[PDB]
Amino acid sequence: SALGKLQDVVNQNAQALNTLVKQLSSNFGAISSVLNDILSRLDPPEAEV
Amino acid sequence: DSFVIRGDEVRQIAPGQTGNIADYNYKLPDDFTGCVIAWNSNNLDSKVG
Amino acid sequence: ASVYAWNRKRISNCVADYSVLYNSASFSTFKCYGVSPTKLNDLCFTNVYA
């Protein structure tokens, strides 16, 4: 644990990137989190929503 | 734009509708602005034969 | 069947042409909720129930 200050910065940046990548898996109230599924399932008036 | 259709087909003169005269007779855009006007014309556009 | 004893039929292992359902004018109401009616020929399904 001598080099914890640099490893803390590396872990924080990697965890922020992992969280940002993980946030694509959330649908945020939509029917799906995949854009291609919405564009292939729905008409543009509701796919727009 | 004036035409004569059935009584159940007046819901298809609208943005974002699926239907028959919407696809092959008269299509409205999704960003349509204006007013659709409909009134019964059984006394004028109908014959007993 | 009646609505209290509604009949459930499984649909599986078939290729389905929904364009004869869209182009028929015999249905007074043809309203889809989780899917567009015109995209039904482009997708694959399981657990189809009537």
Curated annotation (Swiss-Prot), chain B:
| Reported impact of K47T | In strain: Omicron/BQ.1.1
Q: Which domain of life is it from?
A: Viruses
| Effect in UniProt of substituting D8N | In strain: Omicron/BA.2, Omicron/BA.2.12.1, Omicron/BA.2.75, Omicron/BA.4, Omicron/BA.5, Omicron/BQ.1.1, Omicron/XBB.1.5, Omicron/EG.5.1; complete loss of interaction with host integrins
- Impact of changing V48P on the protein? In strain: Omicron/XBB.1.5, Omicron/EG.5.1
Integrin-binding motif, as annotated region: 6-8
Subunit arrangement?
A: Binds to host ACE2. RBD also interacts with the N-linked glycan on 'Asn-90' of ACE2. Cleavage of S generates a polybasic C-terminal sequence on S1 that binds to host Neuropilin-1 (NRP1) and Neuropilin-2 (NRP2) receptors. Interacts with host integrin alpha-5/beta-1 (ITGA5:ITGB1) and with ACE2 in complex with integrin alpha-5/beta-1 (ITGA5:ITGB1). May interact via cytoplasmic c-terminus with M protein. May interact (via N-terminus) with host bilirubin and biliverdin, thereby preventing antibody binding to the SARS-CoV-2 spike NTD via an allosteric mechanism.
Q: What does this protein do?
A: Attaches the virion to the cell membrane by interacting with host receptor, initiating the infection. The major receptor is host ACE2. When S2/S2' has been cleaved, binding to the receptor triggers direct fusion at the cell membrane. When S2/S2' has not been cleaved, binding to the receptor results in internalization of the virus by endocytosis using host TFRC and GRM2 and leading to fusion of the virion membrane with the host endosomal membrane. Alternatively, may use NRP1/NRP2 and integrin as entry receptors.
Q: Please give the name of this protein.
A: Spike protein S1
What organism does the UniProt record list as the source?
Severe acute respiratory syndrome coronavirus 2
> What part of the full protein is here?
398 to 446 of 1273
